[PDB]
Amino acid sequence: KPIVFSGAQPSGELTIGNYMGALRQWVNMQDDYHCIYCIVDQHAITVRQDAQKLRKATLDTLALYLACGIDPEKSTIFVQSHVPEHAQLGWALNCYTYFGELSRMTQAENINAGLFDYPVLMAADILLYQTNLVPVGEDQKQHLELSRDIAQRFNALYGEIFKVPEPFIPKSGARVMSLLEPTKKMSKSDDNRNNVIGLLEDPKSVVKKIKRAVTDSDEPPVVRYDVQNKAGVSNLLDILSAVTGQSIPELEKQFEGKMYGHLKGEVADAVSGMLTELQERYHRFRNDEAFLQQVMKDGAEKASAHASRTLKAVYEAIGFVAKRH
Amino acid sequence: TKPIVFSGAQPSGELTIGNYMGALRQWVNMQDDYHCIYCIVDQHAITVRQDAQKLRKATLDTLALYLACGIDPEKSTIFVQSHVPEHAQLGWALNCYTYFGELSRMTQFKDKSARYAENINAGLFDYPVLMAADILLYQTNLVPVGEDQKQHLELSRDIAQRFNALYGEIFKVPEPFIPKSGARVMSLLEPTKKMSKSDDNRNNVIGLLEDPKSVVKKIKRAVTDSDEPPVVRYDVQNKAGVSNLLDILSAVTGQSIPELEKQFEGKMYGHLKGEVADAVSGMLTELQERYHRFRNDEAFLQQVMKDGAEKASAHASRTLKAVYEAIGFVAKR
Ligand SMILES: Nc1ncnc2c1ncn2[C@@H]1O[C@H](COP(=O)(O)OC(=O)[C@@H](N)Cc2c[nH]c3ccccc23)[C@@H](O)[C@H]1O
Ligand SMILES: O=c1[nH]c2cc(Cl)ccc2o1
């Protein structure tokens, strides 16, 4: 099975876009690939933040990934800082990364060195596990390209130590746009929280956010799919289709002679119907301390076994004297 | 418990009389008075591109050389940097409390960048952060280094103070221990330039493992000055070469500059160089004699590395656990 690496940021609260897009896609491919989910707490600290909230958010993220259906018995899920090899390989790859490559990243004296240097750590995160495939958003494409360049550069000097990773090209295909701005994709980082539906929102909050969702001034109101002229209504249809599995033409027929109130009502009920099973699993996992501790221990153990084999090969190539165990 | 001493040296090139006088001499003398921890910094060495066989051999050379100098594994913790993962771990964490501008302004990064233009790498840039992690891991009170490491030392103090101010007394604030004499030994044919163990021109350098005969010849050819009459007087601005020779003689013999100036009153650079060459030849002959006994005893070197990494790991894991708890990581099981 090809090895797939994903970094999970411990800060973002996941939206229905994150879930019905990438996450649901990957949950159903856990037997197809050897999937690795790394909760990236070492990446998080490049932004100064409250310590207790970082600890909490690491555990929130673990429980939510578990709730969404990541299976600890099929996939490897772990906390980045629990596997020292990340930092170790990161230092080594720092020495085969050009300073120029980091300064050319699309992102002066007062930024912290972590924010400058984290694409090297990202390269180490991927290359440690002999990763074949990395799912990346547009913003992470430069970083993946750097990891490929580093891998090839090191391999040219020392032999085939690393796999050259490839982007995971096919996208989930569920379209989820922002509620008050239907041209912009729904993103966890959005400042306007009314643009998004988080995975932990109760039915009252979802009704409220969906009721405010932008539509159009068509007279009579008509539930028809048209991204150019009816962005808002189209987004509502795409969300409803994503939840229920009903086709757009089927939904267009279902809402014949119906107004946007009826659409919104069903969108809110559909979305909340999806989130209640998800929230039940989340709160059950999140408050089982022993379960979460066991997932983290098992995950770190699986990760370290793989990571240590790569690091040993890297260290031997560079020429370091092997540790006396 | 005793205050803690920590210092390191790279297994890159062959250590010089400069490395000895600025660092290793002080290391040896601090062993009973403080709890001393000495590191072969192989992770720092690779910021300059090394041949893999050269690096491995130089790591072991450097270890045997510490032992030959009088570093005693019964008194001091002696270890190889890459054997203790906590250095890289804490290094990453401290990256996040270090500013870009603090690193770009470093003289060492600038000098090494000019020298290795085809390999201006991120490790070379990030050099001081790993060095701060090396020091701060061991609750270090004193850091014996040469003058050239002063700026790096100062940043490690700033990082420690900065981190402590947010999170409490996690680190000790280290202090530099730079000797009065021999802190900046200069090149023999270019006494305005620091003696570098990887100098292209070997005649600039007195290597610790260099044939004494070769070293005596280098001392006789060291540049002095045009003063008429020749006078042996310490004066860095006007008499760089003569001063460097005096500095070297002082550090080997133990005699002060006034004592040496008095000794050479009415004498010229023949006497100065004759004495420097004799003192240094004798030191290197004896040093190299103990060195080969250690260097060819692989079982002893293996045991020293094993015991040292064990002792180091005990301290390092303790500090890292506290750092991780403070910054807010979920503790490993
Ligand atoms: N010409 C000279 N005259 C006098 N002293 C000199 C001369 N050349 C070098 N030194 C000193 O020798 C020690 C080792 O040099 P390195 O280049 O390995 O030194 C270096 O490159 C350090 N970054 C290694 C290091 C890594 N981590 C540490 C933590 C604490 C102390 C030191 C370290 C140093 O003390 C250096 O100041
Ligand atoms: O000091 C440092 N810088 C580092 C950068 C990476 Cl990616 C990893 C470890 C490090 O330690």
Curated annotation (Swiss-Prot), chain A:
A motif ('KMSKS' region) lies at residues 185-189. It catalyses: tRNA(Trp) + L-tryptophan + ATP = L-tryptophyl-tRNA(Trp) + AMP + diphosphate + H(+). InterPro entries: aa-tRNA-synth_I_CS (IPR001412), aa-tRNA-synth_Ic (IPR002305), Rossmann-like_a/b/a_fold (IPR014729), Trp-tRNA-ligase (IPR002306), Trp-tRNA-ligase_bac-type (IPR024109), Trp-tRNA_synthetase (IPR050203). The keyword Aminoacyl-tRNA synthetase applies. ATP binds at residues 9-11, 17-18, 137-139, 176, 185-189. It holds the Pfam family tRNA-synt_1b. It comes from the Bacteria. GO terms for biological process: tryptophanyl-tRNA aminoacylation. Signal peptide: none annotated. It is found in: Cytoplasm. A motif ('HIGH' region) lies at residues 10-18. Catalyzes the attachment of tryptophan to tRNA(Trp). Amino acylates tRNA(Trp) with both L- and D-tryptophan, although D-tryptophan is a poor substrate. Homodimer. NCBIfam families: trpS. This is Tryptophan--tRNA ligase. It comes from Escherichia coli (strain K12).
